[PDB]
Amino acid sequence: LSTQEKSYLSAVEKGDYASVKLALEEAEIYFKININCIDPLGRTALLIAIENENLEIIELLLSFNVYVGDALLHAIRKEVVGAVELLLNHQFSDFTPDITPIILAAHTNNYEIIKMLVQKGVSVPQPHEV
């Protein structure tokens, strides 16, 4: 924050690339801000890039090892294929503790994610009949 993270968030959301990168490896050495602040509405810069589906920023952020959190879940909800395409290979949240990637993936019929996660291999739990 401190009118230091505000520029970072604005650059990320507006679509800039060079400025965002420069901010990354500047704050990486001056230890001035945290890369993973959530100012406005609990929105990590990663989430901001996710919801604008801007692939370049997301793939750049994966380089700097910024904390991921349950961003995979947000991408799944948003139905963006490239985001989960990248994320797949390598406190209190707003998602119920029950939900796993496959459950939410099935909650929205979108062939691609179901096929991908089946390729990786999962196993949805089964209930006990009554």
Partner: peptide, 22 residues
């Protein structure tokens, strides 16, 4: 969402062109 994505893509193309102009 479509509004956001269109406007953001245009803005990114603007920034790239301006950066590579000079």
């Amino acid at each position: 969402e479509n509004f956001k994505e269109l406007k953001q893509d245009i803005s990114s193309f603007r920034y790239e062109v301006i950066g590579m102009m000079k």
